[PDB]
């Protein structure tokens, strides 16, 4: 938390950070989603699935849940899903998966460093991405923003 804004949501349980004064807007199915006022793809958003599960580890393995999460639930057919390496953390007692992919349409060069979580009969799928034309400068910054999602009760 060098210069980061911990926007918590004590009702829904999620809480994570933002680099520098990203704005506020209503996304189509995400709640805050907080775009960065200059770019069009650089934003971090998170949504909900009312499941009846408790752990992301019992619903499936990480390397297999990212496959049907990106290749079947994220990627539009006109773009290809370059799923990069996937990572796992444990915050307090719960697993915390974090992965990387790039949606490559024949136009629209972009990618996303999305992470996934669960709890409270919800299902967190925090997605942050940016353009592919400038991603190596915005790699570790969005990474250290993205791994900072906490699940609190």
């Amino acid at each position: 938390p060098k210069s980061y804004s911990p926007f918590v949501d004590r009702e829904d349980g999620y809480s994570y950070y933002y680099p520098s004064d990203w704005r506020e807007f209503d996304f189509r199915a995400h709640d805050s989603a907080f775009k960065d006022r200059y770019l069009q793809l650089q934003n971090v958003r998170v949504r909900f699935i009312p499941t009846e599960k408790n752990d992301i580890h019992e619903v499936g393995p990480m390397e297999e849940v990212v496959y049907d999460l990106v290749k079947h639930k994220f990627a539009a057919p006109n773009q290809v899903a370059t799923i990069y390496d996937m990572k796992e953390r444990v915050e307090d007692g719960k697993n915390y998966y974090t992965f990387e992919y790039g949606l490559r349409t024949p136009i629209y060069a972009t990618t996303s460093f999305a992470t996934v979580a669960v709890g409270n009969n919800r299902y967190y799928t925090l997605i942050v991405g940016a353009n592919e034309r400038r991603w190596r400068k915005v790699k570790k910054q969005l990474q250290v923003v993205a791994d900072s999602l906490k699940i609190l009760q």
Binding site: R28, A29, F48, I49, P50, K73, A76
Partner: protein
């Protein structure tokens, strides 16, 4: 071609029994469309199938005995209000209430096909 179906005469109660099982099986697999957030095909399918249900329930109730009428109309109007609130939360698009009322209309269509 529902505009000609207005001009065409109404369906049979057994035709309604066929179309309600078809409508059940078609509401099974809109999960491909919800998670991709294709809300325009979702509002197309919900408004069309609600237009089918509004003429389908009153036609399909006429083959059921009076023991089945009370609980059938109970589950049917439960399905009607669940589908209308699903219509309201897709014409005000939020993913959570949409999938919640989608599971509600699945667990209300699973026994209308049971009649």
């Amino acid at each position: 071609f529902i505009k000609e179906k207005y001009f065409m005469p109404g369906l049979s109660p057994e035709d309604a029994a066929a179309r309600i099982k078809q409508t059940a099986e078609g509401l099974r697999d809109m999960r491909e469309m919800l998670d991709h957030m294709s809300w325009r095909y979702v509002i197309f399918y919900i408004r069309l199938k609600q237009a089918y249900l509004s003429q389908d329930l009153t036609n399909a109730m006429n083959i059921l005995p009076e023991s089945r009428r009370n609980d059938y109309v109970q589950a049917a109007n439960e399905l009607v209000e669940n589908m209308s609130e699903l219509d309201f939360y897709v014409r005000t698009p939020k993913v959570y209430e949409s999938y919640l009322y989608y599971e509600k209309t699945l667990k209300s269509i699973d026994n209308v096909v049971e009649f």
